[PDB]
């Protein structure tokens, strides 16, 4: 999978090791090899949640399979847990969009995964 | 719903109060309490629209339902109108991608909306 | 169509003609007039691919049709080629997500493309 988090938390509040932690925990959660996991953290964003600029995050998780009802509830628990612990963002100020990608619609290494 | 704007307009040209105006106007247009609305504005972007670096915007609106032909036209008039008035972006230099999200594919507060 | 590239490559390493080159190459490759093509490059990103912070890129291509198996493979060879030549990113550290948008789900000019 590919995990993107946009947040109004400042860059200096993103701890050392965060990208590696996300990579490792997504590998653990999805069972997928870390060598194909991509993570992207975008701090200092101009955003509001419910009209408030208290800490919040808008995230997305794209996966070729491993997306579904129970899996997504599990990912949300995991990922909100990590954002709360490491970036001090309340889980009720986080949205995560999940996308099940067709392999033919993911390009990589001059081709696609089809 | 969640509304994201990426634009080459500089930060200093985003007016004070713009995130609140977007929240209010989206709540009114969708008939939803502002507590459910998230907004995100990303200025100073390196982008081109039709080969031109004149002011432009690439946006997205994600909603669990309430997406379709007529509603999307109405959102586009509202949102292009706001971007023209507040950021001085011509409506024909705006793209808005509309996404009808399944509740099971939106995470919030350690779970999903399913 | 709309092409977005997020990358950890620094802003200074993006050649000055890069947006125009993307616009022209995508117009050639998609058979669309360049007036319809939007391009967006986001450097200096905090991202990792396979746990590594070597240069990498996470991209997307949105089109109303002109998306599918062989077409996406051709787009990936073209776009990986440009990212390797111009930004010095290895093709095996690039993801490109392809999205076939319905015309009624793309807003533009106060309406949609429906
Ligand atoms: O299996 C996966 O989750 C997976 C997902 C992506 C991906 C990239 N963009 N969106 C999804 C890439 C590679 C993957 O592994 C093979
Ligand atoms: O208003 C929306 O559709 C909406 C959209 C997002 C969102 C965030 N990322 N992508 C979409 C989040 C919250 C939202 O409020 C809800 C939330 C649950 C619902 C469940 C059933 C019906 C309607 C709902 C509405
Ligand atoms: O026809 C197309 O491919 C096309 C696609 C877009 C687009 C912008 N965002 N997503 C899709 C815009 C204009 C187009 O013309």
- DSSP for C50-108? TTB-SS-EEEEEEESS--SHHHHHHHHHHHHHHHHHHH---GGGEEEEEEE--GGGEEE
CA dihedral A62, A67, A72, A78 (to 10 degrees): -60
The residue of chain B with its CA nearest to that of C16 is: B46
Question: Rounded to whole angstroms, what are the CA distances from B86 to A8, B44, B75, B79, B111?
Answer: 22, 15, 16, 10, 36
The residue of chain A with its CA nearest to that of B107 is: A96
If you measure from the C-alpha of residue A82 to the centroid of ligand 2, how many angstroms do you get, rounded to a whole number? 22
CA distance A93 to C19: 35
CA distance B79 to C64: 21
Q: Is the CB of B1 under 6 A from ligand 2?
A: yes
Please give the span between the terminal C-alpha atoms of chain A, in angstroms, as a whole number. 16
What three-state secondary structure class fits B43?
coil
Closest ligand to B29 CA?
Answer: 2
Resolution of the structure in the document, Å = 1.8
Domain range annotation of chain C: 1-114
- CATH number 3.30.429.10 given to A1-114: yes
Which chain C residues are within 8 Å of B53, Cβ to Cβ? 19
Which chain B residues are within 8 Å of C4, Cβ to Cβ? 58
Dihedrals φ, ψ of B6, to 5°?
A: -115, 130
Q: Find residue C42's DSSP bridge partners.
A: C6
Please give the span between the terminal C-alpha atoms of chain B, in angstroms, as a whole number. 15
- As to burial, measured by CB atoms within 10 angstroms (0-12 exposed, 13-18 middle, 19+ buried), residue C12 is exposed
What three-state secondary structure class fits B100?
strand
Contact between A42 and A4 under an 8 Å Cβ cutoff? The reply is yes
């Amino acid at each position: 999978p590919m995990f993107i988090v946009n947040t109004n938390v400042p860059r200096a509040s993103v701890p050392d090791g965060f990208l590696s932690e996300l990579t490792q925990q997504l590998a653990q959660a999805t069972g997928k090899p870390p060598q194909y996991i991509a993570v992207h953290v975008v701090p200092d964003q101009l955003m509001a949640f419910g009209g408030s600029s208290e800490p919040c995050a808008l995230c997305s998780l794209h996966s070729i399979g491993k997306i579904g009802g129970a899996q997504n509830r599990s990912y949300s628990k995991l990922l909100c847990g990590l954002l709360a612990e490491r970036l001090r963002i309340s889980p009720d100020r986080v949205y995560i969009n999940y996308y099940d990608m067709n392999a033919a619609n993911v390009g990589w290494n001059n081709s696609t995964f089809a």
